[PDB]
Amino acid sequence: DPEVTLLLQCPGGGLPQEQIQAELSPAHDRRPLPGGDEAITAIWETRLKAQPWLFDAPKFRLHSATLAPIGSRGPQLLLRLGLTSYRDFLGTNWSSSAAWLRQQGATDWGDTQAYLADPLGVGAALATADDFLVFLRRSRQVAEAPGLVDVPGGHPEPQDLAGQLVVHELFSSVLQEICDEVNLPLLTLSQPLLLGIARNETSAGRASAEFYVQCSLTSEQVRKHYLSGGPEAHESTGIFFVETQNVRRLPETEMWAELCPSAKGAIILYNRVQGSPTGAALGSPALLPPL
Ligand SMILES: CCNC(=O)Oc1ccc(-c2csnn2)cc1
């Protein structure tokens, strides 16, 4: 799977909100482009003169993420974050010259991402009460991964002492994205666990935080909530469910070719962090079939 790389795998089956610190600093921002940020302003002006209804929005930038030594007390993860925008994304990660920018970042800063916006995404492995994960079919009319399979997520917009408010907004945003697209009531959802961070090598390495969320509704009940909103209540064009039993071997199915890179990231981390039992009981042959 060349189109996805794991930056972080969480310990303990996934980290809760109270175990994560963030450092939000202008030291964590994109570097100005070698020939100046004029190239970004040029791409933006051209795009608005074709689609004048488009609007910019602020985004969190991921610089790096450092895990504590395993088994330790106190905070287990530090996220170093900066600020970016949708406009900066269109002029760097989405640019035809994105690979040139990665090479120049390696040469100038020893950092392939130094000239890239790299907005932080969130995504969820969302499990039902009857032990299915939830999947969504992408519109064939949109610019990114048209017609591919996705999981619930998005790119959260800003608004350890500003740090803790930023971690709160990250965890909050994955619940809000599930309520907005799946049309589930907020009270049917568990507090998220962070499984890890995955990079999309088809979007010049922009990263998504991948979370596990449990729903108290069955697959049949989730389907009813999604459809009951009508075609205008969701950007996706269908919902479907795979038994958690069958997620273990998903990379060996014909479904794997239809998954967008950020959804591959969520399923890889779900398999490594929530699946893959460590103990004698869940490890026994009858409960963990070989091959
Ligand atoms: C940022 C919103 N995200 C969220 O709530 O989950 C989704 C999942 C998929 C799509 C989508 C876009 S085009 N075809 N599908 C939209 C939303």
Swiss-Prot record:
Catalysed reaction, written as an equation: UDP-sugar + H2O = UMP + alpha-D-aldose 1-phosphate
PROSITE patterns linked to this entry: NUDIX
Binding site for Mg(2+): 177, 181
Keywords for this protein: Hydrolase, Magnesium, Metal-binding
Motif placement: Nudix box: 163-184
Native source species: Homo sapiens
Cofactor(s) required, per the database record: Mg(2+)
Family that this chain belongs to: Belongs to the Nudix hydrolase family.
EC number: 3.6.1.45
The name this protein goes by in its record: Uridine diphosphate glucose pyrophosphatase NUDT22
Record GO terms (molecular function): GDP-mannose hydrolase activity; metal ion binding; UDP-sugar diphosphatase activity
Nudix hydrolase domain sequence ranges: 117-273
Tagged with keyword Hydrolase: yes
Function according to Swiss-Prot or TrEMBL: Hydrolyzes UDP-glucose to glucose 1-phosphate and UMP and UDP-galactose to galactose 1-phosphate and UMP. Preferred substrate is UDP-glucose.
Higher taxonomy: Eukaryota, Metazoa, Chordata, Craniata, Vertebrata
GO cellular component, one term: nucleoplasm
Spans annotated as Disordered: 147-159
Top-level lineage group: Eukaryota
InterPro entries per record: NUDIX_hydrolase_dom, NUDT22/NUDT9-like
Outcome of swapping residue 177 to A: Abolishes enzyme activity with UDP-galactose
Binding site for substrate: 55, 86, 138, 143, 150, 155, 157, 262
